[PDB]
């Protein structure tokens, strides 16, 4: 075949690692994440009620955002 | 009754403006360790924003290395989290508490691992950072690493004589 080919694979926004075909990819505003990567940067837990705050390119739960940056 | 505006130390440390920081240090009655509204000290901010010269200036005047902010993070947590390797090494050399725990039971190694700061993580383990210490939610530092980093760090810790057994959080 005489056509140029692209080869890009989906990777995690946060960690740049690939996805296994079996795992659920979290989509948050167009961005793909490992489940364990769509978590608070401070406590590493999934966001209660899905609520997070962005600060300087990192995501934080309400508790940690209030404690550190609010 | 006229206000006299001043440069505040926290901004100067964030920005790494060394002369302004030095002028502040020259006021010997300034408290080197006093934190801002969120408990971030001058040293916290200098370490977080990678301002190597200012970090050293503060350390050399005797700033407390293991100061804690409102989340109980130390300067070392922040330097490791944000991958400032030179500053991590400086902190370790001036006897930073390598296994200092924040409000979540996280050590600096948790953040080095989580953020794939591979060489920072290596520097930490090389200086006695425990690889198997659970945070308050049962996660060890190497639980936050990708598998290749996990294995690299476990190997280093093994060679150093660490006990690799998972340590659940107590107290
Ligand atoms: Zn990821
Ligand atoms: Zn959090």
UniProtKB/Swiss-Prot annotation, chain A:
Signal peptide: none
Domain LIM zinc-binding stretches: 10-70
Localization, UniProt: Nucleus; Cell junction, Focal adhesion; Cell membrane
Subunit structure and binding partners: Interacts with TGFB1I1. Interacts with integrin-linked protein kinase 1 (ILK) via the first LIM domain, and in competition with LIMS1. Part of the heterotrimeric IPP complex composed of integrin-linked kinase (ILK), LIMS1 or LIMS2, and PARVA.
Disease tied to this entry: Muscular dystrophy, autosomal recessive, with cardiomyopathy and triangular tongue: An autosomal recessive muscular dystrophy characterized by childhood-onset of muscle weakness progressing to a severe quadriparesis. Additionally, patients have biventricular cardiac dysfunction due to dilated cardiomyopathy, and macroglossia with a small tip resulting in a triangular tongue.
Function: Adapter protein in a cytoplasmic complex linking beta-integrins to the actin cytoskeleton, bridges the complex to cell surface receptor tyrosine kinases and growth factor receptors. Plays a role in modulating cell spreading and migration.
Name of the featured protein: LIM and senescent cell antigen-like-containing domain protein 2
Segment of the intact protein contained: 11 to 73 of 341
UniProtKB/Swiss-Prot annotation, chain B:
GO molecular function: ATP binding; integrin binding; magnesium ion binding; protein kinase activity; protein kinase binding; protein-macromolecule adaptor activity; signaling receptor binding
Maturation and modification: Phosphorylation by PAK1 modulates ILK subcellular location by promoting its nuclear export.
Modified residues (N-acetylmethionine): 6
Assembly, per entry: Component of the heterotrimeric IPP (ILK-PINCH-PARVIN) complex composed of ILK, LIMS1/PINCH and PARVA; the complex binds to F-actin via the C-terminal tail of LIMS1 and the N-terminal region of PARVA, promoting F-actin filament bundling. Formation of the IPP complex is dependent on protein kinase C and precedes integrin-mediated cell adhesion and spreading. ILK also interacts with LIMS2/PINCH2 and with PARVB and PARVG which may substitute for LIMS1 and PARVA in the IPP complex; PARVA and PARVB compete for the same binding site.
Keyword rRNA-binding: no
Purpose of the protein: Scaffold protein which mediates protein-protein interactions during a range of cellular events including focal adhesion assembly, cell adhesion and cell migration. Regulates integrin-mediated signal transduction by contributing to inside-out integrin activation.
Protein name: Scaffold protein ILK
Any one GO biological process: positive regulation of cell population proliferation
Family: Belongs to the protein kinase superfamily. TKL Ser/Thr protein kinase family.
One annotated Gene Ontology cellular component of this protein: sarcomere
UniProt key word Nucleotidyltransferase: no
Domain-related comment: The kinase domain is likely to have lost catalytic activity but retains ATP-binding activity. ATP structurally stabilizes the kinase domain and promotes stability of binding to PARVA as well as focal adhesion stability. The PH-like region is not required for assembly of the IPP complex or for localization of ILK to focal adhesions.
Native species: Homo sapiens
Keywords: Acetylation, ANK repeat, ATP-binding, Cell junction, Cell membrane, Cell projection, Cytoplasm, Cytoskeleton, Magnesium, Membrane, Metal-binding, Nucleotide-binding, Nucleus, Phosphoprotein, Repeat
Recorded superkingdom: Eukaryota
Major localization listed first in the record, in broad terms: other
Segment of the intact protein contained: 1 to 166 of 452
Compartment list: Cell junction, Focal adhesion; Cell membrane; Cell projection, Lamellipodium; Cytoplasm, Myofibril, Sarcomere
Interaction with LIMS1, as annotated region: 38-144
């Amino acid at each position: 075949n005489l056509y140029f080919q692209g080869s890009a694979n989906a990777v995690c926004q946060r960690c740049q690692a690939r996805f296994s075909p079996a795992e659920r990819i979290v989509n948050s505003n167009g961005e793909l994440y490992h489940e364990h990567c769509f978590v608070c940067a401070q406590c590493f837990r999934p966001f209660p009620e899905g609520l997070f705050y962005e600060f300087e390119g990192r995501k934080y739960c309400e508790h940690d955002f209030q404690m550190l940056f609010a | 009754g006229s206000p006299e505006f001043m440069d505040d130390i926290f901004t100067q440390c964030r920005e790494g403006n060394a002369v302004a920081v030095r002028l502040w240090l020259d006021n010997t009655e300034n408290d080197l360790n006093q934190g801002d509204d969120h408990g971030f000290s001058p040293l916290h901010w200098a370490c977080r924003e990678g301002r190597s010269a200012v970090v050293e200036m503060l350390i050399m005047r005797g700033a407390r290395i293991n100061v804690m902010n409102r989340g109980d993070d130390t300067p070392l947590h922040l330097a490791a989290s944000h991958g400032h390797r030179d500053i991590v090494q400086k902190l370790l050399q001036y006897k930073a508490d390598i296994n200092a725990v924040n409000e979540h039971g996280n050590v600096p190694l948790h953040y080095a691992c989580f953020w794939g700061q591979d060489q920072v993580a290596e520097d930490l383990v090389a200086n006695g950072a425990l690889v198997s210490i659970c945070n308050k939610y049962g996660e060890m530092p190497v639980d936050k690493a990708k598998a290749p980093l996990r294995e690299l760090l476990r190997e280093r810790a093994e060679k150093m004589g660490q006990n690799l057994n998972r340590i659940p959080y107590k107290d």
